[PDB]
Amino acid sequence: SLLEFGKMILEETGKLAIPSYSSYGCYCGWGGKGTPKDATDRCCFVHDCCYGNLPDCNPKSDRYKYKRVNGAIVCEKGTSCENRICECDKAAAICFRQNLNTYSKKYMLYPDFLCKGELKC
Ligand SMILES: CC(C)NC[C@@H](O)COc1ccc(CC(N)=O)cc1
């Protein structure tokens, strides 16, 4: 759920999900339309797509358990949905960490009309 995802993000990047990754670019937060603005925005695009592969799961509210094995994020056994949701979140958290260097404040609160383009999962 958002609770685990938010904790994962903070632990990985030192940034709080809200407001750092909740209104960034075209896909971090709202999701919607267009072409991803940068690497961080692409991480959210892929994350949206990952959730998109789980039509009968409820990623925002279904809680999962995860632990740290000397740095590495390890998803613990739960229901199949919980396992898959955790893998999606884990990938996003790592992706955010991998692209922290290019994270740009100019993409925060990015306006909707500037999100144009075509990009299928
Ligand atoms: C706690 C606050 C007030 N509530 C807003 C809450 O809905 C969190 O906002 C969100 C919801 C969903 C997303 C996209 C994602 N992380 O997959 C990013 C940010």
Question: In angstroms, rounded to a whole number, what is the distance separating the alpha carbons of residues 27 and 35?
Answer: 9
Question: In angstroms, rounded to a whole number, what is the distance separating the alpha carbons of residues 58 and 85?
Answer: 8
Question: In angstroms, rounded to a whole number, what is the distance separating the alpha carbons of residues 5 and 95?
Answer: 13
Measured CA to CA in angstroms, residue 48 lies from 70, 72, 118 at distances of: 28, 22, 15
Helices and strands (H and E) in the chain: how many: 4, 2
What letter does residue 28 receive in the DSSP assignment? B
Q: How many angstroms does the Cα of residue 43 sit away from the middle of ligand 1? A: 16
Out of 1, 4, 22, 50, give the residue to mutate to test ligand 1, the one with the largest number of ligand atoms within 8 Å of its CB: 22
Residues with CB under 6 A from ligand 1: 2, 5, 18, 22, 29, 47
Scanning 14-79, the segments in alpha helix (DSSP H) are 17-20, 39-52
CATH of the domain at 63: 1.20.90.10
Q: How many angstroms does the Cα of residue 115 sit away from the middle of ligand 1? A: 19
Angle subtended at Cα 48 by Cα 83 and Cα 116, rounded to the nearest 5 degrees:
175
Burial-class residue 93 by CB neighbours within 10 Å (0-12, 13-18, 19+): buried
Encoded tokens for 13: 């990047």
Residue 99 near residue 17, CB atoms below 8 Å: no
Q: Is 89 a catalytic residue?
A: yes
- Domain extent at residue 53: 1-121
Nearest CA to ligand 1 atom 18: 29
Residue 74: strand pairing partners: 67
For the residues of the chain, what is the DSSP string, one character each?
-HHHHHHHHHHHHSS-HHHHTTSBTTTBSS--SS---SHHHHHHHHHHHHHHT-TTS-TTT----EEEETTEEEEPP--HHHHHHHHHHHHHHHHHHHTGGG--GGGBT--GGG-------
Angle subtended at Cα 79 by Cα 87 and Cα 31, rounded to the nearest 5 degrees:
45
Question: In angstroms, rounded to a whole number, what is the distance separating the alpha carbons of residues 9 and 95?
Answer: 10
Residue 69 one-letter amino acid: V
The CA-to-CA distance between both ends of the chain, in Å, stands at 22
This PDB structure is determined at a resolution in Å of 2.0
